[PDB]
Amino acid sequence: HGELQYLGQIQHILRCGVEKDDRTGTGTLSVFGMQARYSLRDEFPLLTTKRVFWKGVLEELLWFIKGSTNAKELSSKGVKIWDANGSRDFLDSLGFSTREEGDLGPVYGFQWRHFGAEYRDMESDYSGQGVDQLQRVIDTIKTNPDDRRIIMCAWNPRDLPLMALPPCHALCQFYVVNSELSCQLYQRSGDMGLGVPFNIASYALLTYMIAHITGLKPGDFIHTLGDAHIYLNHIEPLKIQLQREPRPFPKLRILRKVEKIDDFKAEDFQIEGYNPHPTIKMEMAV
Amino acid sequence: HGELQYLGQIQHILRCGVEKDDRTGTGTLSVFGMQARYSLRDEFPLLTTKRVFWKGVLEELLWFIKGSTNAKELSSKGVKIWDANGSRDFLDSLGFSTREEGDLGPVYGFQWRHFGAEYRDMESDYSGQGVDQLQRVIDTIKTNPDDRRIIMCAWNPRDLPLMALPPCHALCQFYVVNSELSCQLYQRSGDMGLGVPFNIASYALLTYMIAHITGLKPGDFIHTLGDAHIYLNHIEPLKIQLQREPRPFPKLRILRKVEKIDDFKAEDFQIEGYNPHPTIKMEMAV
Ligand SMILES: Nc1nc(=O)c2c(CCc3ccc(C(=O)N[C@@H](CCC(=O)O)C(=O)O)cc3)c[nH]c2[nH]1
């Protein structure tokens, strides 16, 4: 079904992908330019050939929406996925010695809600500052769904030098037709073993959310990869996953009627019928 | 061959695309999310089922590279393609009455070379201001071709309100492997009848240029569409073009060794073996 698109890319990268060195010191097999279409109609694409950490997914999205750039605010929810890039050693290796541990800089959250804003620290008050792309999107979908410019962009050339790690999912666009909402994302860099499974579920979630607030039904989620790679220490685990057979995707039900996107809380959502294969550990390249 | 990928999209949009209204008042048949891979190896993808206005293509690219945002500077080269969006009526319909005719605002050129810069007018001196993404790319390709962040982004959330028409080709990323350079582009909006044929040739040209300056051979050009559409008054002309049979793509020869990307002049290039079908007129939706 849909999960076959992902499994296909994993295999393609493995057979043809060229070996390439990366900034983390690990090895890589990569391909440049791919695209997969995931349907959000009566199903949510949460991989089944492996049990995905749904919690961190939901928690991360929520963390993004409130415009936070502090690894600690997320680690507080039991989702440690960003701590690594917020460490003292990592911050220092980038020359951010004066920065407080946990401050990722002007990344995802900050750009979605305050693009123009002049960044200070992970604790500054930015309200009212910069452009709020998220809200902007919502309003355009509501007043003119034919608009060919419903875009949310995290890539900010001017702020790059202060980011602990530039956006991998740097740009997404929404589209409307027949009362159903679709979203496409441009991911410059894609760690097929870890981030990608997360990424896919993260945007399918965002779409559902916005579709809810706008009174539209989810359409498709187009995933576009730039540098899609499989780290060397992910090759064996992936080889096994490729052998497992997928199951039908689960469903995402929203337990309540929400008006503003900032109202959503972890409790408002619930996954149904998720029957995945056993978990698979994979080491994140730092 | 390669031109078949394009012809395929035209047909797919026609037989499966949904009718959709657009900002120009014209009608539209659209699809959301597509991708085509064009090879730049010993061939330049300049459509053959129709004779493409190569001049405007080359002239436009050059116009972009020097960071100009004035329709008149291009109309001066005999390429009138942008005049329409720089008119007084159009500028005024957007509320830009105080703006001088021809000033498109902070678009393509301005963002490629001065992303951060604070826009003034199509005649202001921006040198030394904002980030120069173009040069940035060149240097990264030269010092670390494994870099997973070689990106040039025109989409600037903060400047949007001042653009006569937001970027259609809003983001592209480069990739290197085996001494050959590839480029992928994200085009949020795609007028299949006019712009797209231009767009494709425009980026294939840019790639060739950068590959030359960096001492690499062209690889592939991945074209990714967001809202790909065929305007209603383009349906009949396209239906005929779909019936014509493609010919082998021509070759792009660079008549001279160039060091800096700003040195390139229209004369440095030459197309060879271009044998296309007769021209096809199509009215641009304003
Ligand atoms: N190299 C690299 N790749 C990335 O994708 C990345 C990111 C993106 C977020 C991210 C990081 C790790 C995991 C993750 O580790 N997931 C695991 C376990 C998660 C847990 O339970 O804590 C998984 O198997 O899904 C899932 C998502 C930040 N820094 C990164 N660096």
Ligand SMILES: Nc1nc(=O)c2c(CCc3ccc(C(=O)N[C@@H](CCC(=O)O)C(=O)O)cc3)c[nH]c2[nH]1
């Ligand atoms: N709706 C819309 N589509 C676009 O592509 C666009 C653009 C891109 C620039 C552009 C405009 C017109 C033609 C063009 O007219 N090309 C003709 C021949 C032109 C000539 O003879 O000079 C063609 O057949 O390709 C080719 C390129 C700006 N505003 C636009 N609005």
Ligand SMILES: *c1cc(=O)[nH]c(=O)n1[C@H]1C[C@H](O)[C@@H](COP(=O)(O)O)O1
């Ligand atoms: C980044 C964040 C995300 O959401 N998705 C991802 O897969 N990644 C991965 C890609 C790469 O491994 C690393 C970022 O490295 P780089 O900046 O591209 O060099 O995280």
Ligand SMILES: *c1cc(=O)[nH]c(=O)n1[C@H]1C[C@H](O)[C@@H](COP(=O)(O)O)O1
């Ligand atoms: C914009 C510029 C370009 O180079 N390529 C294109 O084909 N276009 C087209 C897309 C769309 O048809 C129109 C812009 O309209 P809108 O801003 O999306 O409303 O020009």
